[PDB]
Design a protein around this nucleic acid. Structure first.
Lengths: 110, 105, 166, 92, 108, 204, 32
RNA sequence: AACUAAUCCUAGCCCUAGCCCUACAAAUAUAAUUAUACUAUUAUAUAAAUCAAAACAUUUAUAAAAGUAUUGGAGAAAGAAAUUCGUAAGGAGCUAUAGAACUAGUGGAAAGAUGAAAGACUAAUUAAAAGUAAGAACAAGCAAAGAUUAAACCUUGUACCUUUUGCAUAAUGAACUAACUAGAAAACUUCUAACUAAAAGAAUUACAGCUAGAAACCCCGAAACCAAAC
């Protein structure tokens, strides 16, 4: 009676209104509604970290790696971590959409 | 060895350089395997140096066909009809680039 | 053991096109087991090479060797099948294109001697191979005349090329 | 001379139960509170379970372990082989 | 479960899917012979004088290549061996259980 | 197992001048007294066998079987013809290449006479133009012309095993009418050997 | 596949049968 | 495309594991296998030597403590106990010169090969070893090399293995083809790591040691000697 949901891609691009989603997440997750020096706030609290990271991951769609999980001590790391784009495009896929010259032929036989 | 081996005289194909120089090499074919240590050097070559050679020499037809392959291979065809095959098995990017330059010349 | 001579007789050519000469018939016949030496049989084969079917048969009839009688029997069998199965119109229109003998599997025994010595006894067997081409035997070679010899020497002199120079 | 015929095609499964379960409980001693030493998991001839030695030592240990259960023919052969082995190692 | 006179369906072969009656059983090779099925054509009486006469000769079928047929419904139904009231063993279809009586075969 | 029986149950007698020749069909209507009871027996097992429509089915098998000869489709020809017919067709064609083609039939095929544990033989009348050319092993032409149509009238007998559930109509034999012209002669010339005598004997 | 149950040493006292010939003598001594 | 030949996979074996074992008639120890009288009927001492000690003579193996002590032509080597401690079918094996000698004890061999079906005409597959044939030879020379328009001519060049002196115009060995056919051990050191005044999953060593890993030493062949049978 359990049906698998469709597989989701791991490609994430920074939103144009990145801060809007970020501040809205803090505005909701954090009662103080984005207080002063929010960037320098610590995430050592387990409950706050779970709510903030989980809420950001669902709203944004990008999740902190477990290997990189401990690095997220401050909001600055989270903000910097999210703003860097992530692409699932393969090297072959990038080559295909790279203005292939007329004399170069590529065929994927796999 | 000379007695047991053939020899020829100096000659040109059709006086190629009299009016304008034409590159004898006409087609290059590259076979690759997505998962093969032997092709690792060839794998990187496509990313970086294959494009530069194509721009430098646009008169040679280039074929890149990734496929399940035990040993990557390069096939070069010349205008006169000569065809030469070189194995790329477990060869680095630098080795591949040097061979291609020799083939073009 | 290999029997590829017979397979040569089983070869079937593609249908001939209208613009093609009538293919001369080629027949491959052999006797695989003969209690005779190949070397002795070869002498018979060598002489008969290139001769006509009738000429070879006549010589065999007056030959003293045992192998010659066997060869004539082999020749007769090949001729009979050639007309019967290879569509040969004329019996006389046949000549010996190829004739050779080969080794066959032998038998080994010990040769006793009256003085306590012993030897290795061998019962020799051989194969005989012949290919017959329909038509008269090709004309024999004509020795070169003095004029022919001189022309080649002059041509060779003219063909000489300067060596190791610009 | 070399074969003129192709061998039968063979495909081997690397995820069969034997290969998949190979090595399990190899850490029985450390993970089992050391109640069972990993040497206890060795399966083989009785005289060399958890023990190693040279060919001469292995044969001698075999003789002691199953000497009472060894055949007379086997025992006689082992004694003769041991004598040759003893002389070679201890004098050459 | 296969005996001479048994109506069986050829699972695979030249006449696969054609039901026939067994006439010979070489149990050593697990071979079942059906008359008029899997029948190739061969030359009988080949001699020097005459080429020979073409005849239809049956070929052996392995046991797995045939299956028993339920009388009422003609299908290759798998069968299981079970006794009857009389005690004679009878093959019973695994599905749509039914008694396949032993066929009558003329004396050889 | 035999799916065919050599020979014909009763040999139908062709009348001279039938090639010139409705008409003959009515002669069958007159002669169904001899044949209808046979036709009923085929009909009993089949019930769709009609003398009018059988030639179309029979013709295809005859033409199809001839085509197999060029390709040497022995397996295909085996099904088309009975066991008796097959050896005659191909035995003498060994190691030979034949180009056979079918020109338009001169006259429509019609069932002529039928007879019948039970083997039913149906005689069919066929006049058709065909081209035949046979070559040697070397490819040399030995018989027939590549593109010359030869008009031949023959009566073809098909047979079927009525009792067998899988029995079907397969070509069994051909009836040759005496008035039919002789076949074309071979291109090559043959030699008839003289009488054989012992050394004592003299020619007679 | 599912791994088999881990091997376990039998706990508690074990009394060898004195009558059995196979049982070693030292296992039947008062010191044992 | 030819001959001679070659081709193949199961015939089977090997070692551990497991397991002790308790598997027709007629004729026969007389002369074994002779259907009834003869004529009484019956094995076995330390195992030695060879061998090692480079001969030979006493002598020479057949869990920890521990290879410690003693013993011993003090030499080849031999070696306890006290006292502690001890429950519980498989193959990085062989596949017809390999594996048991074996298809077979027929001192002791040799060998077989189609396909699903031969109640489908008995299979194919291979420029594949040497040997030959197809196709004998053509002034001159360790037979090739540099060459050359050109196969031979012209030019250059004292067969091979081992061994002698680091030299052979010495001397050994080789008709040729295929398979088979000769370096094997860890006490200590260096190196690679773990942990460290401690190291090691009991028995060991320690003033940086201790623990683990890795690193090594052939083949064929006498004249002989002794025991037990014939």
């Amino acid at each position: 009676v359990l049906v698998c949901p469709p597989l989701r891609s791991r490609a994430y691009t920074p939103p144009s209104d990145l801060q809007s989603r970020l501040e809205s997440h803090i505005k909701e997750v954090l009662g103080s509604s984005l207080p002063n020096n929010w960037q320098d706030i610590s995430l050592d609290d387990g409950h706050m970290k779970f709510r903030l990271l989980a809420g950001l991951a669902d709203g944004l769609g990008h999740a902190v790696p477990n290997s990189r999980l401990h690095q997220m001590c401050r909001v600055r790391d989270v903000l910097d971590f999210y703003n860097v784009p992530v692409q699932d495009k393969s090297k072959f896929d990038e080559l295909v959409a790279s203005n292939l010259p007329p004399n170069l032929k590529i065929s994927w036989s796999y | 060895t000379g007695r047991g081996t053939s020899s020829r005289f100096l000659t040109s194909v059709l006086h190629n350089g009299l009016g304008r120089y034409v590159q004898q090499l006409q087609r290059l074919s590259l076979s690759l395997s997505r998962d093969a240590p032997s092709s690792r050097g060839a794998r990187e070559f496509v990313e970086r140096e294959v494009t530069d050679f194509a721009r430098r020499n646009p008169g040679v037809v280039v074929y890149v066909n990734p496929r399940p392959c035990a040993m990557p291979r390069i096939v070069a065809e010349y205008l006169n009809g000569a065809v030469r095959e070189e194995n790329v098995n477990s060869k680095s990017v630098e080795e591949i680039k040097s061979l291609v330059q020799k083939l073009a010349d | 053991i290999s029997r590829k001579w017979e397979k040569k007789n089983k070869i079937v050519y593609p249908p001939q096109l209208p613009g093609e000469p009538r293919r001369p018939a080629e027949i491959y016949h052999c006797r695989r087991q003969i209690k005779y030496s190949k070397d002795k049989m070869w002498y018979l084969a060598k002489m008969i090479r290139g001769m006509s079917i009738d000429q070879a048969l006549a010589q065999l009839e007056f030959n003293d060797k045992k192998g010659a009688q066997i060869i004539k029997e082999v020749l007769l069998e090949a001729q009979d099948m050639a007309v019967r199965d290879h569509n040969v119109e004329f019996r006389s229109n046949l000549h010996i294109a190829e004739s050779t003998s080969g080794r066959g599997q032998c038998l080994k025994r010990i040769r006793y001697h009256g003085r306590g010595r012993f030897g290795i006894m061998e019962k020799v067997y051989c194969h005989y191979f012949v290919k017959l081409v329909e038509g008269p035997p090709p004309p024999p070679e004509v020795p070169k005349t003095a004029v022919d010899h001189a022309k080649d020497y002059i041509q060779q002199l003219r063909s000489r090329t300067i060596i190791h120079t610009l | 001379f070399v074969r003129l015929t192709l061998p039968p095609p063979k495909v081997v499964d690397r995820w069969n139960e034997k290969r998949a379960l190979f090595g399990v409980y190899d850490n029985i001693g450390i993970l089992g509170n050391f109640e069972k030493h990993p040497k206890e998991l060795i399966k083989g001839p009785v005289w060399l379970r958890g023990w190693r030695g040279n060919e001469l030592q292995r044969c001698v240990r075999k003789k002691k372990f199953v000497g009472n259960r060894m055949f007379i023919e086997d025992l006689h052969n082992l004694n003769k082989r041991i004598s040759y082995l003893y002389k070679h190692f201890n004098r050459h | 479960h296969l005996f001479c006179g048994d109506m069986v369906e050829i699972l695979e072969g030249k006449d696969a899917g054609k039901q026939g009656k067994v006439v010979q059983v070489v149990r050593q090779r697990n071979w079942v012979v059906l008359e008029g099925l899997n029948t190739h054509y061969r030359y009988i009486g080949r001699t020097k004088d005459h080429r020979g006469t073409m005849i239809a000769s049956e070929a052996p079928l392995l046991h797995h290549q045939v299956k028993l047929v339920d009388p009422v419904d003609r299908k290759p139904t798998e069968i299981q061996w079970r006794f009857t009231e009389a005690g004679e063993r009878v093959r019973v279809s695994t599905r749509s259980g039914r008694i396949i009586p032993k066929p009558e075969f003329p004396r050889a | 197992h035999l799916a065919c029986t050599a020979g014909i149950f009763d040999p139908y007698v062709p009348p001279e001048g039938d090639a010139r020749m409705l008409t003959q069909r009515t002669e069958r209507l007159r002669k169904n007294a001899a044949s209808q009871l046979a036709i009923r027996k085929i009909r009993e097992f089949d019930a769709n066998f009609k003398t009018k429509d059988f030639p179309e089915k029979a013709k295809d098998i005859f033409i199809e079987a001839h085509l197999c000869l060029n390709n040497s489709d022995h397996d295909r020809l085996h099904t088309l013809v009975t066991e008796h017919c097959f050896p005659d067709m191909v035995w003498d064609l060994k190691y030979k290449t034949v180009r056979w083609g079918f020109v338009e039939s001169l006259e429509p095929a019609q069932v002529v006479h039928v007879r019948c544990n039970m083997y039913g033989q149906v005689t069919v009348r066929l006049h058709t133009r065909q081209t035949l050319a046979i070559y040697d092993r070397f490819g040399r032409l030995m018989y027939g012309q590549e593109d010359v149509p030869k008009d031949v009238l023959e009566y073809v007998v098909f047979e079927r095993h009525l009792m067998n559930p899988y029995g079907s109509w397969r070509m069994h034999a051909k009836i040759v009418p005496a008035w039919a012209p002789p076949k074309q002669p071979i291109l090559k010339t043959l030699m008839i050997p003289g009488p054989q005598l012992k050394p004592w004997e003299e020619y007679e | 596949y599912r791994a088999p149950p881990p091997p376990r040493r039998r706990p508690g006292p074990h009394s060898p049968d004195p009558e059995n010939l196979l049982t070693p003598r030292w296992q039947l001594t008062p010191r044992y």
